[PDB]
Design an enzyme around this catalytic site. Structure first.
Site, PDB file in Angstrom:
ATOM      1  N   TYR A 169     -91.404  33.423   4.308  1.00 44.90           N
ATOM      2  CA  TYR A 169     -91.530  32.082   4.866  1.00 44.90           C
ATOM      3  C   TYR A 169     -90.184  31.369   4.909  1.00 44.90           C
ATOM      4  O   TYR A 169     -89.765  30.923   5.980  1.00 44.90           O
ATOM      5  CB  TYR A 169     -92.550  31.257   4.083  1.00 44.90           C
ATOM      6  CG  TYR A 169     -93.971  31.715   4.295  1.00 44.90           C
ATOM      7  CD1 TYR A 169     -94.499  32.782   3.563  1.00 44.90           C
ATOM      8  CD2 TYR A 169     -94.791  31.083   5.222  1.00 44.90           C
ATOM      9  CE1 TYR A 169     -95.799  33.207   3.757  1.00 44.90           C
ATOM     10  CE2 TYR A 169     -96.100  31.493   5.416  1.00 44.90           C
ATOM     11  CZ  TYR A 169     -96.597  32.558   4.685  1.00 44.90           C
ATOM     12  OH  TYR A 169     -97.888  32.980   4.883  1.00 44.90           O
ATOM     13  N   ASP A 179    -101.403  37.941  11.256  1.00 43.02           N
ATOM     14  CA  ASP A 179    -100.553  37.066  10.425  1.00 43.02           C
ATOM     15  C   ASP A 179     -99.070  37.431  10.645  1.00 43.02           C
ATOM     16  O   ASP A 179     -98.599  37.403  11.782  1.00 43.02           O
ATOM     17  CB  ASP A 179    -100.975  37.135   8.942  1.00 43.02           C
ATOM     18  CG  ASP A 179    -100.337  36.037   8.089  1.00 43.02           C
ATOM     19  OD1 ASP A 179    -100.793  34.871   8.162  1.00 43.02           O
ATOM     20  OD2 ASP A 179     -99.387  36.350   7.329  1.00 43.02           O
ATOM     21  N   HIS A 238    -109.656  34.878  10.054  1.00 40.44           N
ATOM     22  CA  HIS A 238    -108.267  35.308  10.015  1.00 40.44           C
ATOM     23  C   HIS A 238    -108.054  36.731   9.530  1.00 40.44           C
ATOM     24  O   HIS A 238    -107.231  37.451  10.097  1.00 40.44           O
ATOM     25  CB  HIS A 238    -107.493  34.301   9.175  1.00 40.44           C
ATOM     26  CG  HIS A 238    -106.093  34.721   8.832  1.00 40.44           C
ATOM     27  ND1 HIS A 238    -105.027  34.369   9.577  1.00 40.44           N
ATOM     28  CD2 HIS A 238    -105.599  35.459   7.755  1.00 40.44           C
ATOM     29  CE1 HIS A 238    -103.910  34.870   9.020  1.00 40.44           C
ATOM     30  NE2 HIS A 238    -104.261  35.535   7.905  1.00 40.44           N
TER      31      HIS A 238
END
Lengths: 424, 380
Positions: free
Chosen positions: A341, A195, A398
């Protein structure tokens, strides 16, 4: 490339405490009491649409059992003990008190201790790595070496301080972590990430090839013009860039992007309005739980979106999942965690053109079946010219280290074996 | 184009009650008390980034004042009375108990009562229209008609029931409101809407040109403002849960829009500036029709339904367009004739943003009356 940039309160620049302080995770009794009663006094939720599963997001009918479990069954004292089974520390890097786990194996003569920096993403934490650690740090006798692990909370995640001013994107975190390894006394080391950790680790390898002696990634991805164009060239005739046995991980492209449109909602809002969406998640245990757990559903196996319950029992126990939630709840870090983000999608950060500067460090890539995206070695070699291998698994999603701890650790050790082998 | 499609619990289909029942908006004392406690037992929120205003979304420094006002100064019993100053009704249309406001003027002979359907969007409500109503329904000696207003709550919004199964997108709401107007006894009417109201009205005029005799629409840095749409269109049930439970969350999520969509430059301000146009009471009123009805999730679902493969043409009815200068998608008058061949005029106000009727009630009412006046002169 600014290595001394200050992210904390500016008045403490001349009062920096640079020591390595031991640290205990605590679930204080007032926190636990307040959490219980906030769950107890919850609101009725709109009933879900019948027979839809998780296709509209978290099924509200599933909230009762999770919240009841969290309030009444989850062993707060035992779990605190579970989390503290490893050594924690804090030290101030660039104004921020950064938390890290450090696990050092005891070793027989003839076995070398080797440093590995292990990096989590969102909405995970250092909790992700617990079950993998005994395997990562084990002595074998098939191996020359054993791993010493450093595992930091990202700034604004878990037990690490958050930036006080704008600008802290992935590239800046790369710097903080390089400074951290320097603080702790390391000159050379390996890095592993998924990630965000894959992104930040990739940047460290880009910036500091002298220090990073090997990079392992379980989230290998290039979103550059050249990579995307090559992605589309392979749509014309696939056998040019990808093996047919692996072709269904990428093709047809219309599937990839349709599922991408369906799943990138969280990312879109976090990259633009993280302070807005994060406020309800800060205040509501039901909100936080729904928002984070939905990911542990879809990102593990997309087909789980069909099931009424998640299926959030597919891989993990309730305690394992609430452990991770607790690292968001008890530290109030959901908003600060989301800001990464917003920072990373900045015009400034994109102008750094990270996807076009090559990584000249030996690289290894792990590609699980149900990762959110996939790229063949041919396109990957553009960002990683020194790619040693791409290990393909037929299982997992993931949260690889959290989901398949044995398989994860085995592959990381295999990579480092091959890295040491080539250095000769 | 199914006119009978059922949206509520199917057992009601045989036992269908078709009466129109008066309805009173209430803030029950237990809901009010729970809201107060939930506000007072407040978590300390993460501080905002230095000097950034509303650029990362709602600025958490403002949370104390808002939530404190709501808990201590917002006069609940008094606001309930304000909300009941106009007649409200409920009637079952296609399985859903649909709420609507109905305002009828007292008219002397020689004055025609003309019905206007007025449609709100998200994250608004029938609250948007309140101060426009006295001007819209005014009886003029200079006019041969006075307006009667019908203002419904969109299904899953305010006091109107949510669909119990997938599929209720804007086109389907166009059907429901067609059936609402027939249940009320109107064979022809005018439609006004912005946001979802504009898309629903557009659809109404497109499907039933014989009953829509006039359509007034007021919705004819961009990527930075689309995150709410993306998540609501895909995972409305996830994002909606926090907002159902947290007064701070709901307030932050909704008011950010009243900030930006009114004027994008206000994103720079530390405070919003949420004092720019409305009193705190005015905005909390709209919040209450989400909080007290627990309708945030159901309201967001409309996005998910409209952005489906099954949901995704010209209006042949006289059309009027009112454009605010501070609206998000500013579009030239030439490309409007493409969508509306029978465009009568396009008014352009230099002042004003997205929530026109709510922001500028008088200028709104005036433009609507003028449009309807011109509509009535065309036929001849």
């Amino acid at each position: 490339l600014d290595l001394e940039e200050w992210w904390g309160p500016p008045e403490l620049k001349q009062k920096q405490d640079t020591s390595i302080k031991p640290f205990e995770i605590t679930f204080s009794e007032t926190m636990v009491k307040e959490l219980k009663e906030r769950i107890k006094k919850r609101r009725p939720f709109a009933p879900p649409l019948e027979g839809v599963g998780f296709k509209y997001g978290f099924n509200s009918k599933q909230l009762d059992s999770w919240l009841k479990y969290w309030a009444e069954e989850y062993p707060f004292a035992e779990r605190q003990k579970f989390l503290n089974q490893y050594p924690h520390f804090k030290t101030n890097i660039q104004g921020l008190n950064i938390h890290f786990m450090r696990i050092t194996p005891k070793v027989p003569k003839g076995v070398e201790i080797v440093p590995l920096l292990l990096l989590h993403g969102w909405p995970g934490s250092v909790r992700e790595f617990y079950e993998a650690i005994p395997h990562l740090t084990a002595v074998s006798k098939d191996r020359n070496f054993a791993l010493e692990i450093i595992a930091p909370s990202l700034p604004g995640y878990g037990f690490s301080d958050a930036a006080v001013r704008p600008g802290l994107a992935a590239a800046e975190v790369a710097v903080i972590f390089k400074n951290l390894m320097a603080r702790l006394g390391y000159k050379q080391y390996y890095v592993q990430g998924g990630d965000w950790g894959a992104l930040i680790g990739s940047a460290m390898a880009t910036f500091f090839p002298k220090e990073i002696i090997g990079f392992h990634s379980n989230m290998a991805l290039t979103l550059s013009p050249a990579a995307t164009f090559l992605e589309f060239v392979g749509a014309l005739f696939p056998s040019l860039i990808v093996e047919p046995e692996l072709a269904n991980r990428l093709y047809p492209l219309s599937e990839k992007y349709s599922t991408l449109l369906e799943e990138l909602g969280y990312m879109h809002i976090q990259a633009t309005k993280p302070d807005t969406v994060g406020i309800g998640l800060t205040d509501s245990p039901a909100g936080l739980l729904a928002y984070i757990l939905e990911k542990f559903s879809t990102w593990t196996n997309p087909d789980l979106r069909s099931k009424e319950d998640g299926g959030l029992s597919y891989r993990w126990t309730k305690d394992q999942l609430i452990d991770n939630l607790m690292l968001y709840w008890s530290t109030k870090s959901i908003v600060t965690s989301m800001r990464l983000y917003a920072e990373s999608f900045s015009s400034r950060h994109f102008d750094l053109k990270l996807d076009e500067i090559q990584v000249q460090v030996p690289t290894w890539v792990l590609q699980a079946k149900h990762e959110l995206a996939y790229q063949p070695p041919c396109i990957l070699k553009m960002k990683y010219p020194k790619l040693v291998n791409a290990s393909v698994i037929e299982d997992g999603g993931h949260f690889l280290a959290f989901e398949l701890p044995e398989i994860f650790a085995k592959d990381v050790l295999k990579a480092i074996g091959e890295f040491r082998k080539l250095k000769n």
